[PDB]
Structure formats: C-alpha cells, structure tokens
A paper describes a structure:
Human cytochromes P45011β (CYP11B1) and P450aldo (CYP11B2) are monooxygenases that synthesize cortisol through steroid 11β-hydroxylation and aldosterone through a three-step process comprising 11β-hydroxylation and two 18-hydroxylations, respectively. The last step of the synthetic pathway of the major glucocorticoids, cortisol in human and corticosterone in rodents, is catalyzed by steroid 11β-hydroxylase cytochrome P45011β (CYP11B1), while those of the potent mineralocorticoid, aldosterone, are catalyzed by aldosterone synthase cytochrome P450aldo (CYP11B2). They are a pair of closely-related cytochromes P450, and their amino acid sequences of the mature enzymes share 94% identities to each other. As their physiological functions, CYP11B1 converts 11-deoxycortisol (DOF) and 11-deoxycorticosterone (DOC) to cortisol and corticosterone, respectively, while CYP11B2 catalyzes, in addition to 11β-hydroxylation of DOC, 18-hydroxylation and 18-oxidation to yield aldosterone. Thus, the key feature differentiating between the two enzymes is the capability to process the successive 18-hydroxylation following 11β-hydroxylation.
Residue numbers in the entry: 31 to 502
The structure:
Amino acid sequence: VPRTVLPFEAMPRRPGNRRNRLNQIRREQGYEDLHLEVHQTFQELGPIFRYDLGGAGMVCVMLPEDVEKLQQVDSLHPHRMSLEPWVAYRQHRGHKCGVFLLNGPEWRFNRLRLNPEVLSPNAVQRFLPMVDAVARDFSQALKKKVLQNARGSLTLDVQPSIFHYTIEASNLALFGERLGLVGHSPSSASLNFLHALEVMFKSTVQLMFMPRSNSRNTSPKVWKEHFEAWDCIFQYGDNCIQKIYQELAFSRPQQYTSIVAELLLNAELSPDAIKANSMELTAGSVDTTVFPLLMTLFELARNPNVQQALRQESLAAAASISEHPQKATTELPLLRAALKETLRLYPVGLFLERVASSDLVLQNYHIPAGTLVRVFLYSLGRNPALFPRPERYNPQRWLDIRGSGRNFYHVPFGFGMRQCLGRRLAEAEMLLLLHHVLKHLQVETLTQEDIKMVYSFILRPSMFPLLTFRAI
Ligand code: HEM
Ligand SMILES: C[C@H](CCC(=O)O)[C@H]1CC[C@H]2[C@@H]3[C@H](O)C[C@@H]4C[C@H](O)CC[C@]4(C)[C@H]3C[C@H](O)[C@]12C
Ligand SMILES: C[C@H](CCC(=O)O)[C@H]1CC[C@H]2[C@@H]3[C@H](O)C[C@@H]4C[C@H](O)CC[C@]4(C)[C@H]3C[C@H](O)[C@]12C
Ligand SMILES: CC(C)(C(=O)c1cccnc1)c1cccnc1
C-alpha cells in the first residue's frame, strides 16, 4: 500500500472498556439492537472504525467507496464463513454442499454453472411468467377477500400470506411445481414442506447463538430438529428431481419449464451437486424476500402520494405486462426504484462480509490481509451526505441518483461474483406482487409510527402492524 496511508493502528477504535449498561443490555436483549449500536458508533467516530472484542478487531465501514474497494480485492472465489449447522447436516447425511456453503475452486465451478440459469437476463425472461402467474393468484385471492367482507375493507395480518407467496413463486421457478399455498386447504405434503423450511431457519438461528457451556445437552434436541427439517426439505427436493427426470426422459418438452430441469439438461453439475444447489436456493427464500415486500407495503400505506404514483405507473403498464410479463423489467421504473428505497431503509442482511484476501486501503487506512471487513447496510443507507433527508421514503431519488460511486449505492444483495444468486428471482417476486396488488387495491395502516427492527441473524420487524385493504 502507499507510504502516505494511515497505519491500521490509527483507525478509530470502538471502546471495549467503557462503563455503561451494555453488559445488562446484552443480558436482556443480546444483539437485537446491533444495527443501532453500530450506527451510533459511526455517528461518533466517522464512517470507518475497528470494533474491538475478544482480542480481535472487525473493520466496520458504511460507504459505497469501501464496497467498490472490496470488490477490487475479491479473489476468483471470495471466502465465505460457511453456515455451520447447514454444513454439519450435509456431512452427517453425505449430501453435497452448494454455493451457499462451498469455498475455493469448487465454489467457482458450481457458481459459473448456476449463474446462467438463475441470475442472467435470459433466466429472468424465462421465469417471469411463472412468478407473474403466482402474483396474479395471490392478488386475486386478496381482492376476493376484500370484496366479500361485510365492511367494504379487510384488516389482516399479511405476513403469513406474503411469506407463502414467496415460497410458492420460488418453488415454481426452481422445480416447476405449485405447492398450493394460495388455496385455503393446501395438501399435508405442502404444509409439511413449508413447516420444515420454517423449523430449518428457526433452528439455524438457535444453533448459531447456542452458548458454548450449554451445547452438550441444550443443543442435541435442536440439532435433531434442524437435521429432521433438512431431511424433509431434501425428501421434497429428491421427489421433484425424480419427477423431472421422468419428464425429461419420456415426455421432454421443447420449452423451458424450471431452473432445475435446465440444470439437469445442461448436465454440467452432477445430480448430487444440482440437488445441493437447488436445496440452498430453496432455503434462500426463508425469512428474506418477505421482509422488504412487507416494508414496501408499510411505506406505501404511510406515503399515499408515492402509493398513487406507483398505482398510476402500474395501471399505465397493465395491458403491456398482461400481454408479456417480461415487460415488467423495463415498464415499472418507479416501482423498481421503490424496492431500492425499501432496501435502503430496511436491509435484510445487516452487513456484507469479506476477509481481506490481500492488504488493501479503506478510507486511507492500511487494512492488513486477513482482516474481517463488514459493510453495515443499515448505516450505508441512512448517510445524509449520499441520501438527503434519509428518513424520507422517496423512490424518485433512484431515478435522480448522482455521485461518482453510484453503482455501489444499492448493495443489499452484495457485489461481485459472490453476490446474491437469488437476487433477480427475489426482485421479480416483489415487483410483480406489488404491480398486481396496486392495480386493484389501496393499503393503509392504523398508525404512522416507525416499525422497530430487531437483529436476529437478519433484521426483521418486531411487531409488523395489521394492514387495511380497500378497492380503488
Ligand atoms: C430481498 C431478499 C434478499 C436479500 C437482501 C439477499 C441478500 C443476500 C446477500 C447480501 C448475500 C451475500 C452477497 C455478498 O456477500 O456479496 C446473499 C447470498 C445468497 N443469496 Fe440472497 N438475498 C435475498 C433473497 C434470496 C433469495 C430469494 C434466494 C434464492 C432464491 C437467495 C439466494 C442466495 C444464495 C444462494 C446466496 C449465496 C451465493 C454464493 O455464496 O455463491 N437470496 N443474499
Ligand atoms: C461439541 C458439542 C459438545 C461436545 C461435548 O462437550 O461433549 C456437541 C454437542 C452436539 C454435537 C452435534 C450433534 O450431535 C449433531 C451432529 C452429530 C454428528 O455425528 C457430528 C456433528 C454434530 C453437528 C455434532 C457436533 C458436536 O459433537 C456437538 C455440537
Ligand atoms: C458483533 C457481535 C458481538 C458484539 C459485542 O459483543 O459487542 C457478534 C456476537 C455473535 C455474532 C453472531 C454469531 O456468531 C452468529 C452469526 C455467525 C455468522 O457467521 C455471522 C452472523 C452472526 C449473526 C454473528 C454476527 C456478529 O459477529 C455477532 C452478533
Ligand atoms: C439475508 C441473508 C442471511 C444474507 O444477507 C447473507 C447470506 C449469505 C451471506 N451473506 C449474507 C441471506 C440468506 C439467504 C439468502 N440470501 C441472503
């Protein structure tokens, strides 16, 4: 690094030895306010600091310029601190690890053979009609509940139905199957699969935060629950892959039907590798897309001028998107901007993480090779220097957006070759559900109070309010 950069020792340090009630806050609520605690530290120390704990020091950053510098020192296979409970399940049952868990050349081999079928513009053009079909079914089911309510309006908890929508849409894109989670009586097999997804994620978070001194005897029931949930998920995956094998051998269609069928036809990855990646993509919808979809509905309820501008756009584009759902990618610029605005205020992952593959420089400080660097998305999005009136929900800011490093202003899906593999499937699900709902319905909430987010592996709303829908 240049001789003019400040030494690592000069970086502002978060005091580890202050007298305050953090000790007691940890006893009572653990790390549930970590986003706010780190945000306060950036306010005090500036946009880079060393978080000292247990003899170690994580570098905390929050600027687009830092994300750009990290993308520069990404290797051909950026290192990931693999989710241990998920790895342990694969080790125990003799399943492969997929891109969520792999490192090194094996990660890259897998990733390059998935990108064209999941992340590419061509992949999106193929799956958009399937996501559109599920979005229509969800939107029609809600409109029907509204129009049959005695009170001319429907106040409901939308959290379960929006979650079910994301699983239904993703599972259709991946395996070409409808679980039926829009019906009032979905099959026991579909509900068992959904339950297993929920238990898998809940048990992941319980195991990651299991104290060392309690693992021997508190963890075995949780490990059992985790592995039994994964067994159910892998049974569903095997069932779908066997069905696809049968279709491709004896009844092969000319047209695209599913991401997994395309991977099996390509035959670049082994069947066991395709299953592992399909199960990780399956898991990728659990407790992710639901949150920005909910928070977009919440902010549209609070910002009726923005809601009406999005409704005008969706009504003007409605005919074009009905003819070719693929048009949703270019004909709803303000709604795409609204998704960026939701994720600016309400990231799902709290941070992006890299281990410095080489010495580098961030904010004119020398960063030694091997340093843990975390980009805190909550703080990046609330920087008033880059996002004037950062508390304001203003999708127009993205159509206006200026500044040198503007490519790195929107990074809630990460960056570079190890960015979120599911990002375009997540984006399409959010875009099309909101498009179809806004054409038919208006949303409100009783109070305009900010939602409290809690950090529990992901950032999630504490007490998401009932929403009220009415016909337009
Ligand atoms: C709004 C919803 C979501 C957000 C904000 C999100 C965000 C992220 C982020 C930040 C990463 C790490 C990227 C990096 O370090 O550069 C990631 C990885 C990943 N995400 Fe997502 N994600 C979401 C939804 C999904 C969905 C729906 C799927 C699957 C259908 C998915 C599949 C994955 C996979 C497989 C990886 C690992 C990629 C790899 O390591 O090669 N994600 N996501
Ligand atoms: C290391 C810890 C406690 C060890 C002890 O003090 O006895 C034990 C408790 C539960 C154990 C895990 C559970 O038995 C579930 C898994 C069982 C597999 O046979 C090994 C990995 C596996 C993931 C185990 C790893 C490790 O041995 C754990 C985590
Ligand atoms: C930063 C914080 C410690 C802060 C403090 O004691 O002041 C630590 C303690 C436990 C850590 C978490 C746990 O190790 C569980 C998770 C492990 C994953 O690899 C990253 C996220 C993950 C959710 C961790 C994030 C973060 O490093 C946590 C929350
Ligand atoms: C939200 C979460 C946990 C995420 O931000 C993440 C996942 C892997 C690595 N880094 C961040 C995630 C989880 C599943 C799919 N995509 C994203």
